[PDB]
Amino acid sequence: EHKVIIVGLDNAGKTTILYQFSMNEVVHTSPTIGSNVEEIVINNTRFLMWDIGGQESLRSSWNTYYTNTEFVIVVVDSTDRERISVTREELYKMLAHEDLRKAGLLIFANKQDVKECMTVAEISQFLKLTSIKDHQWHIQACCALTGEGLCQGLEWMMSR
Ligand SMILES: Nc1nc2c(ncn2[C@@H]2O[C@H](COP(=O)(O)OP(=O)(O)O)[C@@H](O)[C@H]2O)c(=O)[nH]1
């Protein structure tokens, strides 16, 4: 009865984040008709997960899944400077969709354990987050391997 979308490039840390969220909680894979989206239920929250930037981004059939989404979590690999422009494009296409009008936006700046990664300030600048006025948003440094920063992101969602 809570619905959250979690998106990001392949290798961003999505599944690692969901593992962390699932520790000491009830978790199961909820069957989905397609092979595009994976639905992971953790307690009473349904997380809908997919990779951005592929063939499916040419179509975005997953926009049927936007209905009633409470939060969009965008996972960014803070080391992947080459591809972050792809995430940016996809973020703004999502924010334009009328079915996500009510959603809050949580950006996880993941892999902040890694030397020379982009800083949270730099990611925020690159993504123009200060431009986002019609959705509430938060950006959060994390390391999904250890879980550091994940509880802060969860609290932001729970505060809302
Ligand atoms: N160094 C580091 N590696 C990470 C972090 N989060 C995830 N990884 C690793 O990056 C790879 C991709 O992560 P994964 O969760 O499978 O990404 P997904 O494709 O978005 O689901 C795996 O080898 C993870 O162990 C992190 O915060 N720091």
Side-chain angles (χ1 to χ4, degrees), residues 1-55 57-154 156-160:
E1 49 85 33
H2 292 301
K3 187 187 186 164
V4 175
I5 288 174
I6 178 158
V7 303
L9 294 165
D10 58 300
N11 197 57
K14 302 184 297 296
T15 53
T16 309
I17 291 172
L18 290 188
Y19 189 81
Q20 289 291 321
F21 284 178
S22 82
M23 270 173 59
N24 307 110
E25 308 300 341
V26 193
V27 57
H28 73 95
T29 304
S30 187
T32 55
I33 201 169
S35 36
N36 47 330
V37 179
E38 197 157 340
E39 186 170 310
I40 307 301
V41 180
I42 301 178
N43 297 339
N44 294 258
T45 305
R46 312 164 50 200
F47 290 93
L48 296 156
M49 177 169 60
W50 62 91
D51 302 310
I52 67 189
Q55 195 186 232
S57 288
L58 287 173
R59 188 160 74 161
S60 295
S61 58
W62 49 55
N63 58 14
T64 68
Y65 284 107
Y66 295 165
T67 321
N68 298 315
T69 292
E70 286 163 76
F71 295 96
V72 177
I73 302 176
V74 176
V75 183
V76 176
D77 178 341
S78 304
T79 75
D80 198 348
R81 290 177 164 88
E82 285 191 12
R83 296 195 306 161
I84 186 168
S85 68
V86 177
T87 303
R88 187 183 62 203
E89 190 71 35
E90 302 301 301
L91 170 61
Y92 284 97
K93 288 174 160 57
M94 297 180 71
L95 290 178
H97 199 283
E98 65 272 14
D99 291 342
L100 293 179
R101 190 173 67 76
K102 302 189 210 191
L105 175 63
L106 176 57
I107 309 295
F108 276 128
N110 192 38
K111 319 206 183 174
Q112 289 283 311
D113 59 299
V114 179
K115 284 182 179 159
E116 299 178 327
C117 68
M118 299 181 65
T119 69
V120 171
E122 291 170 337
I123 291 165
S124 186
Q125 289 182 283
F126 186 76
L127 299 177
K128 308 296 177 283
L129 296 180
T130 173
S131 86
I132 300 162
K133 299 293 191 179
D134 294 331
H135 296 83
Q136 292 308 281
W137 64 267
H138 174 62
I139 182 166
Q140 176 67 50
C142 59
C143 172
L145 298 170
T146 62
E148 178 155 21
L150 301 183
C151 292
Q152 292 90 317
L154 282 167
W156 181 80
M157 287 188 286
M158 288 171 190
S159 77
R160 308 190 141 268

